[PDB]
């Protein structure tokens, strides 16, 4: 009778659809699949010689494990190329330094076996780096966190990076899956000086004609302040800007510093960070450190989805995959549904369904381990917001939410959803201002 969720643990999930099935590939050579994005089936969980994705993995990827001095793999991407085969961009990292290698493996079938084609990037060397100059982690990337994608003109690209020298994009050979020659680490999009920015992902939206670069700010752990951000560009390889028109290219921590959160915070649209709808007298959903996302555009239905992992209030470091639907606002920026996907769609909303009291989450613009708390507001029939904040609300057309709060104009959507914690239907809104600040309302 009610939505059924079956949970899986896939860190850094990278979504791929093939033959009517969705798969996510993550770190530690973990993977899961689903037909409906709600009920997931765990397929693999860890690197070992009995992992079916890569038979005898420690021999198959011997060189990568040797360079990285690790027994595991970090965030994988799988992408199907024109030859119909599946290309896995694998990587490993020592973890205490950007000592890493990235390579590609290929499989006839989605669930493997994947066979190594070779390493094509390294970082953390003492001498000459991939761009011809000696390796410097303040300006050169850690060669991890790949996501490979086609642009609107059939060109193949790979964006990648975590911390260290920043986020880079490489143009790739559509026939071999390897980078085209003579690019070094490729073209820098942002980052440097050990900025807490990783997990880059690009999704082209045909309806707005923008490429959207999703990013994770902060650290992935429960005290890390992980949050999902986004910027956009006319071209796949930049330049990228945020909602205020800040160029992302200059976003980085100060020279001579490590993990300068204060310098990067003001840049990029912040879609989601730690939050809870729960109060002393009411249960509610809540995430700690949501991040490392991929995204999927469904060509049949036209809907978009954010796929990520998250931790949870009170549950330490345990993580699960979550899916939230994305909607494009008037300004051409996405907003996330406040609740995980349960088959909802943008339907007609009537003003009679909107008026009432809402719990309000303001995700803000910071990198903070502080779990955002709700405040109460009222959306009144006279098209005014009153309560712990004030302004005006109006429904544009079918379900577009034009809301003003604290003298700032927000745009997004009204959306009826399922609350899987309270197990009730809720009216929600999800909106975003020109400063890239996101607000969630739940009634
Ligand atoms: Ni990723």
From Swiss-Prot:
Annotated cofactor note: Binds 1 Ca(2+) ion per subunit.
GO CC aspect terms: extracellular region
pH-activity profile: Optimum pH is 7.
GO terms for MF: arabinan endo-1,5-alpha-L-arabinosidase activity; metal ion binding
Keywords from the named record: Calcium, Carbohydrate metabolism, Glycosidase, Hydrolase, Metal-binding, Secreted, Signal
One Gene Ontology term from the biological process aspect of the record: arabinan catabolic process
Residues reported in the UniProt entry to bind Ca(2+): 292
Swiss-Prot/TrEMBL cofactor(s): Ca(2+)
Record InterPro entries: Abn2_C, GH43_arabinanases, Glyco_hydro_43, Glyco_hydro_beta-prop_sf
Catalytic activity, as annotated: Endohydrolysis of (1->5)-alpha-arabinofuranosidic linkages in (1->5)-arabinans
Enzyme's top EC category: hydrolase
A Pfam family the protein falls into: Glyco_hydro_43
Positions annotated to bind substrate: 12, 96, 142-145, 162-164, 194-198
Activity's thermal dependence: Optimum temperature is 50 degrees Celsius. It remains fully active after 30 minutes of preincubation at 50 degrees Celsius, however, after preincubation at 60 degrees Celsius, the residual activity is only 15%.
Annotated site (Important for catalytic activity, responsible for pKa modulation of the active site Glu and correct orientation of both the proton donor and substrate): 145
Protein name: Extracellular endo-alpha-(1->5)-L-arabinanase 2
Organism: Bacillus subtilis (strain 168)
């Amino acid at each position: 009778q009610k939505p059924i969720f079956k949970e899986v643990s896939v860190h850094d999930p990278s979504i791929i659809e093939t033959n009517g099935t969705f798969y996510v590939f993550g770190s530690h050579l973990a993977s899961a699949k689903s037909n409906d994005l709600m009920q997931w089936q765990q397929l693999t969980t860890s690197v070992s010689n009995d992992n079916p994705l890569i038979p005898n993995v420690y021999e198959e990827l011997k060189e990568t494990f040797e360079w990285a001095q690790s027994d595991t793999l970090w965030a994988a991407d799988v992408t199907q190329l024109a030859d119909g085969k599946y290309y896995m961009y694998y990587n490993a990292c020592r973890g205490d330094s950007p000592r890493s290698a990235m390579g590609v493996a290929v499989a006839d079938n989605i669930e493997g076996p994947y066979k190594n084609k070779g390493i094509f990037l390294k970082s953390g060397m003492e001498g000459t780096s991939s761009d011809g100059t000696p390796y410097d982690a303040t300006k050169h990337p850690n060669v991890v966190d790949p996501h490979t994608f086609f642009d609107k003109d059939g060109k193949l690209w790979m964006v990648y990076g975590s911390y260290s020298g920043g986020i880079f994009i490489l143009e790739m050979n559509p026939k071999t899956g390897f980078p085209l020659p003579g690019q070094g680490y490729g073209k820098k999009l942002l980052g440097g000086n050990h900025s807490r920015i990783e997990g880059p992902y690009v999704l082209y939206n045909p309806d707005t004609q923008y490429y959207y670069l999703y990013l994770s700010y902060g650290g992935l752990d429960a005290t890390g302040g992980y949050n999902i951000r986004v910027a956009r560009s006319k071209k796949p390889d930049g330049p990228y800007y945020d909602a205020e028109g800040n160029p992302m290219l200059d976003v980085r921590g100060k020279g001579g510093t490590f993990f300068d959160d204060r310098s990067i915070e003001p840049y990029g649209v912040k879609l989601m960070g730690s939050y809870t709808f729960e109060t002393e007298n009411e249960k509610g959903t809540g995430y700690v450190s949501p991040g490392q996302n991929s995204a999927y555009y469904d060509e049949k239905t036209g809907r978009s989805y954010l796929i990520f992992h998250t931790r949870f209030p009170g549950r330490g470091e345990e993580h699960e995959v979550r899916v939230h639907q994305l909607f494009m606002n008037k300004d051409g920026w996405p907003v996330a549904a406040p609740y995980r996907y349960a088959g909802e769609t943008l339907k007609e909303v009537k003003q009679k369904d909107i008026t009432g009291t809402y719990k309000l989450i303001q995700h803000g613009k910071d990198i903070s381990a502080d779990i955002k708390q709700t405040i109460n507001i009222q959306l009144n029939k006279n098209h005014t917001i009153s309560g712990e904040m004030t302004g005006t609300w109006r429904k544009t057309g079918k379900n577009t939410a034009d809301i003003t709060l604290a003298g700032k104009k927000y745009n997004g959507v009204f959306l009826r959803q399922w609350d899987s914690v309270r197990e009730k239907n809720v009216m929600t809104f999800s909106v975003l201002n020109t400063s890239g600040e996101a607000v969630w309302g739940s009634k």
